A = this chain, B = another copy of it.
Amino acid sequence: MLEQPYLDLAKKVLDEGHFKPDRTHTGTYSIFGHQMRFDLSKGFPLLTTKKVPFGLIKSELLWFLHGDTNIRFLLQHRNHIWDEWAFEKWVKSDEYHGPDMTDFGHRSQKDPEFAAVYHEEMAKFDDRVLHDDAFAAKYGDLGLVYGSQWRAWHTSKGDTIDQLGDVIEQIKTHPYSRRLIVSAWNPEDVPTMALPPCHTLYQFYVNDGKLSLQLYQRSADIFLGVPFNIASYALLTHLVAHECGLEVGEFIHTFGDAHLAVNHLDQIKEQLSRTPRPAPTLQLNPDKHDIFDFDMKDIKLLNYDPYPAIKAPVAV
């Protein structure tokens, strides 16, 4: 079925990946270099063998797409994927006056009595970002994230490039171009960012009226990360194809280091017992064409019928 490539990457890491330490007290099993294809005319690759929240995956992408770097848009669609990086900033800053909150990510997962204060402060931090304008502008704004790297790359003569807007324009006028490339890796920010981007670079490709997209992903968490990554970029393929009025082609997903966390073996094995169902269909608004001004209600998912979600611990 559509998703087999992903079930094949999980199996491949299980009986083939080697043990490799990382930023965590536990390790990972990992491989290096891996490529998968999804024919997007076959259906949309949201996993069926595990419930994946599309609304999250899509409100994040819109954010990227508007070139926004402020958490606030996200909070307003109840999407919190990005709160820990914002709130970190808050905490290491003058203006903050609360229980230190040092190394809160690790310590969220030991103490059930800290994990309860972290969850209080965070709710207030989210609250202030949502209502206090001055506040958002100071700690709601992440600075370097995909949205500005895509739509406002800072030059050396202090202006701004919209890589993606220009690229889309190129697709419209030089479809056979071999240089349709949006990159998110700036070698001058990289050594001082707490997260240099995982989604390093991608490249668009046109042939016979079809748009395809290859993603170069330096590092992928097979269980938690890669199910979301797949849908993000398959959605982007669709949106760009829609804006250029091209038919949709293939999403190619290339990896550097694909890993599975050692405390996720059981969950992943559980996943491999399930038998894929038919893929959902994606469905974009026909009246609206500028994808830059797309909203939530413009992108529908149809016939998504997943297995239950698989809760799992996180890696810290």
Contact = CB atoms under 8 A, between A and B. Distances in A.
A154 B153 contact: no
B188 A155 contact: yes
A190 to B, nearest CB: 7
A176 B216 contact: no
Given A252-B32, A252-B33, A218 B178 contact: yes
Contact of A176 (B20, B154, B201): B20
Interface string A248-262: 001010101100000
A183 B187 contact: yes
Interface in A173-197: 176, 178-179, 181, 183, 185, 187-188, 190-191, 196
A22 interface: yes
Contacts of A205: 32-33, 256-257
Of A18, A33, A166, A205, which is in contact with the most chain B CB atoms at under 10 Å from its CB? A33
Given A156-B158, A185-B181, A257-B205, A35 B33 contact: yes
Interface of A: 18, 20-22, 30, 32-35, 37, 153-156, 158, 161, 163, 166, 176, 178-179, 181, 183, 185, 187-188, 190-191, 196, 200-201, 203, 205, 207-208, 212, 214, 216, 218-219, 250, 252, 254, 256-257
B32 A35 contact: no
B153 A155 contact: no
A177 to B, nearest CB: 9
Contacts of A34: 35
Of A32, A35, A181, A252, which is in contact with the most chain B CB atoms at under 10 Å from its CB? A32
Q: Which 5 A-B pairs have the closest CB atoms?
A: A33-B252, A35-B35, A178-B219, A156-B156, A32-B205
Given A20-B176, A153-B187, A203-B256, 4 more contacts: A33-B37, A35-B254, A183-B201, A216-B216
A161 B256 CA distance: 23
A92 B33 CA distance: 43
Nearest to A177: B22
26 contacts: A18-B207, A20-B176, A30-B207, A32-B250, A32-B252, A33-B35, A33-B212, A35-B35, A153-B188, A155-B188, A156-B188, A161-B188, A178-B218, A178-B256, A178-B257, A179-B219, A181-B185, A181-B196, A183-B185, A183-B187, A185-B185, A185-B201, A200-B201, A201-B201, A205-B256, A216-B254
